[PDB]
Design a protein around this ligand. Structure first.
Ligand code: HEM
Length: 155
């Protein structure tokens, strides 16, 4: 255990076990997240010009969409993998933030929008396994990751 990491040892184990289940179909989860983002905030689709005028069905098999979906889920999965190496976890999350600095139209306030989308994918995929306890833990951990991503953006 490392006190820089937000979760207690018990909560960290709950995260790792739950995520192991969720991670079975990571690319699908990423696709779900981006499609949810575009529902909640249609103007976010405009930040990805390669997707213009394409329906969710046309996107699901699209190569550029597959790439973007993987880019949006991968750092969360890499973060869980690195739960016991905070120094590396911090390097990786701050890099994600730094990578949005020059995205046209991007604002720091947008990172938090991805949180609800990840939560949506977690709820939908885990179904009854998304317990009240897991909801609590995911809210803490997802919030903490966003803060680190934002730090990287502000560097
Ligand atoms: C709603 C907020 C966000 C929007 C609108 C957004 C949009 C984008 C766009 C347009 C790009 C560059 C084009 C592309 O690769 O498709 C990008 C890159 C990326 N985003 Fe996001 N992003 C958001 C938040 C996040 C979050 C929360 C993560 C991970 C936790 C993430 C991970 C990445 C990664 C890994 C890249 C690739 C960076 C690179 O290869 O240089 N993004 N994002």
């Amino acid at each position: 255990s490392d006190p820089r990491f937000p979760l207690t040892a018990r909560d960290k184990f709950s995260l790792v076990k739950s995520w192991k289940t969720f991670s079975r179909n990571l690319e699908s989860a990423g696709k779900e997240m981006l499609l949810k983002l575009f529902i909640e905030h249609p103007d976010m689709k405009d930040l990805f010009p390669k997707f213009k005028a394409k329906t969710p069905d046309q996107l699901r098999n699209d190569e550029s969409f597959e790439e973007a979906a993987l880019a949006h889920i991968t750092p969360y999965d890499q973060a869980v993998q690195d739960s016991d190496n905070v120094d590396i976890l911090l390097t990786n999350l701050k890099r994600v933030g730094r990578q949005h600095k020059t995205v046209p139209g991007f604002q720091e306030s947008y990172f938090e929008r991805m949180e609800k989308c990840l939560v949506f994918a977690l709820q939908t995929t885990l179904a009854d396994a998304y317990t009240e306890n897991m909801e609590r833990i995911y809210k803490i951990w997802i919030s903490w990751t966003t803060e680190k991503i934002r730090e990287g953006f502000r560097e």
